[model samples]
Target chain A: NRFVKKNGQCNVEFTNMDMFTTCVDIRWRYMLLLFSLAFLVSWLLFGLIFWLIALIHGDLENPGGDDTFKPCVLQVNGFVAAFLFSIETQTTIGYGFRCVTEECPLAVFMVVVQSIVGCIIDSFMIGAIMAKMARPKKRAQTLLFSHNAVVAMRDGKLCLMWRVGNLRKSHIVEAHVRAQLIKPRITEEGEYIPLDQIDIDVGFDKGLDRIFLVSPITILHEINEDSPLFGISRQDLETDDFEIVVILEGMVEATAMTTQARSSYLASEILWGHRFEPVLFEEKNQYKVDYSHFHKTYEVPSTPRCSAKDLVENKFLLSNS
Target chain B: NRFVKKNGQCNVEFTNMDMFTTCVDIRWRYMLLLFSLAFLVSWLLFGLIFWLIALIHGDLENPGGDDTFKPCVLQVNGFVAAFLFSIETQTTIGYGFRCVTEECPLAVFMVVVQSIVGCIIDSFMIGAIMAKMARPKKRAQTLLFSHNAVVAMRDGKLCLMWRVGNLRKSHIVEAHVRAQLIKPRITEEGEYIPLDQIDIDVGFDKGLDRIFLVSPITILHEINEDSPLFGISRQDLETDDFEIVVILEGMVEATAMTTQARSSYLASEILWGHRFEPVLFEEKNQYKVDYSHFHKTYEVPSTPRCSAKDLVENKFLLSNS
Candidate 1:
């Protein structure tokens, strides 16, 4: 009948899974920071309990009030001993720094209780840590999004496309498809980056099945003034030298339901024959959960979470090679 | 002192763990069954201790094992209760069916100690279970090996190969190289398996970085058996679509390195102008693990884990299509 009568506030801590997480970006360190604060508060209250006890000399005949009530002296003192006892118990070394005796019967009882609690907590902690060590992206494994991307027929060309699967699976993805760029017969002037822009449409039928491949239509387009393609016509884009990046985002569709925005790129859009590839992040700092400007280095704030390289690099390393 | 004393056997009872495994494949069940039997014996011993008290109750009051040997009721009863109480303490979920009151103060102390001992053993058991679940192979993933495959040159042809790379990475791999499978002009009959046979060697190289790719010449010689210039003609084999497999074992290397033997298929032996397609696996069964076989069926295995109809047909149901 009195099974759970013991106050659950034992100093022998166990699992660290109490931290909150969100998909867009979340950090383990942040979780740890919040957890530390909570733990600090517990210890702070523990310290005050003893400090006040020494000052008041334990003279309150009747502890009163939710706000002014005296802290449980025996319980607070037991926790301090329990916390140290837990360390000895978990390591199983029992250095004998402290011994339980009849003079402090409550303290003796507390040590035994904490030792048992420590035994269970270590098991969960070690298990979780090991599981996480092997898989850095276990929580962010690529999610399969159906119908979020599809083939569309526009401008009488078999154009291939689909929104890079949305918030369910983060990061920008592009068609690693080989495409050719051609400058239109008529040329316009400006810092004209002549990119072969392609048009896209959504299909209501059959989900987003079968991406249609299409031909390029070269018309009057701006010329690349400073692009590596500064003077080169879209015709140079036809070579295998270029890699196209079409941007897509996870946008709110309708309340509960979600959809990805369509990413578009045209043959005329070859702004640069090759933009220097930047050094990618090498650590486990995926997207920051707080969306902190401190974490983002790119123009628009973005999360740095990607399992492997972009789709083309991954495909070549995995399938093509 | 003696804050954490342990007592006799303490193990939880479980009827079965036979959902995905059988006793033959796993021996833990048998070990557990025998262990439970031992626990029952300990339980029976506790009962015998109580019975002894009744036999000596009359002499227990004398307080002596030698001086006319305890003929008193009180002393004899205490001896028996202590024994039963020891086991009772070890197992905490006491049914309350047995009783030991103030008359046995020593028994009361022993009972609490037994409960603490039982808790320790319980902790170890649960910890081990967590460790097992956290093992990398628990979910069965795959990993890639460091290019242990062979690039062979033998019988005037070239071949390149390596075994499956499936360890903790859960890899999906494809080998791409172009090769020409040829028949010399002077060769006769030309009736053969189209160079379908190949020999792999596993000796000579000191390090794992290199190994052998081999093909028995006798098998190749038989192809042009009828030609007058049989000994003089030569042929070549091309790249990619030669063969592929999904390896599941954790990075097993041949005793020797690749490229050391006459493994003729090594990639360097390409004789040029060989008709090529990427290599294909001898059979898709090359990949599988504890779950019977790989979920994929190359040419469609008769027995499938995931049905084709389920994967292709029902998976993409459309509301209006």
Candidate 2:
């Protein structure tokens, strides 16, 4: 299992401050439902206010019978007419039939309030819809990580390595690779550190951690004395109770937004004394990367089975003799 | 100047593929101008088409003369009427007066085309406006970095350090710090590498590279044997022509968008034998960071003036003696 959970729903308490993010993150159907409901509710509520104004002015009873009678709203003989007028006022349709009269000051005030409310609702709906469409989370899907990690000899040194590739044509800028070793440990003082995170050096201190990911590249962590993997032999690796979580983070070239892709390999998922097959090749003045062979690996028979620490100690003993 | 250019306009050739990004990145005034012009142009173009349809159908010649004679559009007797009808159709305002007649199949076809075009235009405008508003670039403004970088003693080892802080109450997530040394170099083969970038180990190989950033924290790169500055003495540092560029990249808490803040220190800005003063303190059960002293530094009088390489050699010589 990965240290960083994927496809997990986070339970967040919905609050007013995060309303915008909540709206943006919700399903499209729910967002549309809310958008329609908000508009309809505002229209109906404003319509009722218009009808009340008409009733108070006694314009509803007189209709158009008296020329001397100046109604609050023109042609608003009933609730249905008031509703139509409300729709027109809020939408700014101005159909020329249902017109607001300046006779009732309260009717004018209600129209102003409805207009402001309509604008506010429109802004929120539009902003949420736009944010949802432009989110860069989907971009991380195209970032590919190898199914398993391989440990073998590289330049006469034992190393832990994994492959990463960008499936998209647009390259991620300033892409950085990071790996963490998640293992439970107890200190000399007997203080337990649950799920202790140790940084795995994937070309750290060298510039190799920052990769230009135009093609699939194997990320390496040398099993040096400082490495947690230094003491891990083929046998020790088989019984190792640890998870190595790899994270690839960079700015999306298209959107200029940061995106992170993560994958993890358990102790069992690491192939000891194995090396990844060469995927990169030069052909006819162009470089080609065969992604079909990206996850392919072969056994390195020459790789030493002994741990790096043991190998170093053996070499020291041999030199002394 | 920073390695990553800020407040610089990028000259990009306008292309169809990147039209969305171009629109989103443009000035608000330009975006609004384009939005208004697009709608107006579409309305006018469709209005002209409608006027032509009326002309071809002989509807313009007969202005509601006979009851048996059906027109292409009911009230579209002139160009002005056709223009009003176009606006109503596109906006879905349907004023009832300028309704399209069943007689013209071309009118029905035009209505469908206009609706689709209107929706397309609206989508583009809304998407661009929303993306521009929700962009996290402005969030980086509140992510503060120290004006100067200091080289001084820390844990009895010389380190290149700078402070970073977030001014906002909202914290940046998964914040990572990176530093690069930019200096010109020539290979033994006489090949020149202009502005060669070398990774400055600001907690590289250690998890200290990632900071919570809730308060001001100093990022350090130890001047070890592996450091490029290891051979540069205090006097040599004044004559060294190189730049140290620091980058802090993280996701904005509110928008979930990636934002990067960058700053650079020239050779002259690097204070040798000086250390940054502590700005973080506890006050009334809360950690308070005084930004007023964020860039403040004090001289370490007993700090070594010799190069790290020379100091290591001197220690070795003393041990042998």
Candidate 3:
């Protein structure tokens, strides 16, 4: 027997995740927890270092007793006060009460190091926040696709169609789109192949791949001889587990940055012999696009298994009768 | 000229964004800002009510002097103190400083109202954080695809190929994959189409969609007569601006939830007459798949423009006699 094949996923250990990915992909609460933990650890560790420095000068336990020799950098001269001093230094608040003394060279050096580390942490946080804010998925909120794709008649042809629209009422610059059909196939050898992914042709005019989707526009795929649906029957639609995956790419009008939106229509989700209701209307010297009808579809008369070409050729004779 | 069509996108306003989508799609800092704003507004509005209550009792200005009857709940008895007390009440911290007096029935009723509002806020926050943590995109971090795809000879037939591997060494149940070709098309009538998207057949076997991926595996699409590259010449490779978009889906190992990963190869990114180097090996009876050569491909002698079938048939005649 052949071994079970593993070919779809890539594995990486958690500890080895890179900085950029970790910053963007980690859970929000986990991110906050990690930041707080780092903050607490840094202050506590530096606070210990300061306390040790004061211990070396013997000025922490009795502040003014060693005033003749060297003064404690932390005004309160205790672990708690030193910890508060560390927090002040890391945050650059200073607070006026606790001050770093030039008399202690080590204390001054640690303060400078803390300031540099604080700068690094601040920059990292700002970049992470920006990455989270500017993610392409954020734009996906305004990019909406119709709930279902319909299959119906168009200009002497049977067409499979779907609609998508931008809720933002803004343009997706130089927008491009593409789609594919994924289903299981049975080979001639009687072996059951799990998936047969194929691309279907769809377009309102010359092609199915690009559109300047400013409003809710329908996508149409003419079912001709070359199409995968050449002889597909209505019953097959129920039995054939398939997925039609659509992807759109363009620069967002607001940000001038590329954004991608994706959605898929399962086989069961397809509405046969149905067409979308028009959403565009003109009123009061202005144009309007209503979304209430976006998901609504009206049925069209069609055969179960006949090719779309045959239907188109028979249309004139059948209509005259 | 024809009117610009409005067919692709739906219309929805930002204010109409449902709570679920807003919670999952908004930025981290923005989420915190909204929470803070809501918290601020709620407390301030309730604080104003409390201040008005004190005014009704004439206990806001001279607190202790009016402490005999209907004593103010806040000892400081000012708007600022009431605001802080409101914060303490909503957070359930209570702080022991400001207590709601039983003598004021209105104060007791207001406290009960604040507690109920606090409960609602707490549940909303916890749910939103959970949704953010469970997003499908987070799984994409470990799912890596090959940097580029290669068009090379496979079993005497020219094929387009790419590789994907499981870095976790775990299984992805019912994994599916797909690929599509997107290019600009010009119609016979001199009209320009923005994109002509077509699906391509992939895999050495019959199916292109499903695989039980556990290790590094290569996907192959034979360039037969049905392929878009059937009549393309070598020069066309450069002039033909096209992209091959690949999408993969599978159930995550740790979580049974479905996950999707996507990537695309531009025309320039596809290397002709090249093949991937093998990475599988064994040491100390252990299997190892090295990724250092994951994107590396070697040059092979081949023709530029013929279909895979033609390439196979011509091999015997074109070979050295």
Candidate 4:
């Protein structure tokens, strides 16, 4: 549940959201509503004002007047017809029987005012819409993390690893990967603090920024005394709400633009003993990546528990016995 | 900018979005609109069916009948009244003069169908709203990144740096910070690519995972040959479109939840030969951070251009001279 959404907004709630923030934060629906509501309210307000002006001028229902104000329709009601005319003018769609005659200078003035107001409101709505459309939300699709992370022995030390791949044709240059183990922290007292985030060293001592993510790569974290996952077992993994947050950042070779990819793995989602299936093979002196196997993980011979100390001790005792 | 939005959706476009994908990717607006429009259309369609049933049974225009469909108003008109009644019933706000009498069993059947449909629609909207409310966007708000990034000399080497701070009372444990450099790439062949992403080594010498952010932490990346900013000059900094994206992930102490914060600095936003003002200062018995200075930056005397090799050569020439 703590996984980063496509926009890098974490799915977990660390704080509250009020209605105003919520309205802005949500996608295009609220924006549409905002624009529509603004335009509608403006049109209706002008419509009501015009209707009132007509009533005061003795134009709507005058008996002796030759050039009296007439609505587009008598059956649809005067108020409704006036509102429709306002919509027509505001939207610049001056169709139908609604019109301001030369005899009524006041009505013509109202039309000009309403038209200007409508133009301002419309420009703002268009600006808002354009801004929303210009957001770069699609970048997340090309950068992907593996579905699951795994714990296994690597280079004589027990380590945690996850795979990531660039689905794009252009390679990402100098990709940097980082991770952290985040969970609840309970103090000596009864007080419990929720987020106790700890850093996980990745890149196998390459200093985290030397990677070129042209193909699939496994990000490794050594499990030691300082690590949060140092003594985690299969049982602990299933029961505890441990989240491993991973971030991959780099510049795309083709676009020369900076981009980021992020994901999170829950304790239950991690495999006990597994290694990634190699996604690359040679073909006619060139290497070809098998993307079908990108998410494919195979089981390796290892202990069910992830504690390196326990694994070492167990092996020592077995040899002695 | 290829930065990630608060919703975890990236700002860069990897591909075009279809209508369905756009709906899912958009913030709460489109989804709410989709649901509301669905419900509204359903209500209207059912209302139309009920109106047609009334038209067939001679209830809508039955002036002399003992119990006719003489709605709450003779003023609001027949079709509009039927639509209003349908909305009232569908939303379960049934009151005022509209009722399904014993004369029409079809009206009762329609009411039953509309209620079930309404229940389904309402439940989905409620669930989606709750899910959106649970997003950890507020976490990004508390975790503040400097408005601008700086490229300056540190310990006799050119380094790119940015500052981040926590504005919350509860400390975030083991905060991990990552950054990337991105720009557009166009080759000699004139093939254009949207993103040319490269990785920046944040926190040189110290591993990427060594950050323990409390008051304010300055993330540093040495401008070595591997660095994306290695040869970037002051002119390039001003003229080119470069984006530095930063992602900070950690656990919140109070909520025991994992959270992430993301932001980006554009080429125009990065201040050359500048450094962030220290926010932390000694207070009575303890240290206090002045958040007002969190975004403050000051100009410093430094090289206008940066290239590790060029800087070493310049130093040698100066020593010989």
Across B1-321, the per-residue lDDT of candidate 3 in tens digits comes to 000012222111111111458667577657655665666677778778777887787777665454466555755377765665665567554544456777678988988999899668756655554455335354444466888888866555567888876665434644668888988888899988898778877642433355545345678787888888665545566767789998787765433356777899987888777777765443332334566766777876643465455565667787954
DockQ of each two-chain model: 0.02, 0.08, 0.02, 0.02
- Rate residue B157 of model 4 by lDDT: 69
**TM-score for chain A, candidates 1 onward in order:** 0.28, 0.82, 0.72, 0.61
Query: How large a fraction of the reference contact set does each model reproduce?
Result: 0.04, 0.12, 0.00, 0.00
Ranking by TM-score: 2, 3, 4, 1
Candidate 1 residue lDDT tens string, B94-124: 2222344444454455445545656665555
Task: Give the range where candidate 3 chain A is weakest over 10 consecutive residues by summed lDDT.
Answer: A9-18
Q: Mark the 10 consecutive residues where model 1 chain A has the least summed lDDT.
A: A213-222
Cα deviation of B253 in candidate 4 (Å)? 20
The positional error of residue A212 in candidate 4, measured at the CA in angstroms, is 1.2
DockQ of 1: 0.02
Of 1 and 3, the candidate ranking higher by lDDT: 3
lDDT of 3 by residue, A1-321 (tens): 111126622121111111235456466567777777878999999989888888787867665444356454647478898788788777766664665543665775576567545544654555455445555332335566778888777776777888877767456777766566756565442323333446676652354467867557887787888778766656677876567766565666875555555567777788887878988665443446667888889876753455565555567798887
lDDT of 2 by residue, A1-321 (tens): 110011111111111110446656788567666666676688778889998999889988865535687787877777766766776676665565567777889998998999899778777666666766676344336688989999876666678989887776555756889999999999999999998999999875655689745556778898899988888888998787999999999877555666788999999999988777766544533345666777888886877898998988899878998
lDDT of each: 0.29, 0.73, 0.64, 0.63
TM-score of chain B of each: 0.33, 0.79, 0.73, 0.56
- What overall lDDT, based on C-alpha atoms, would model 4 receive against the true structure? 0.63
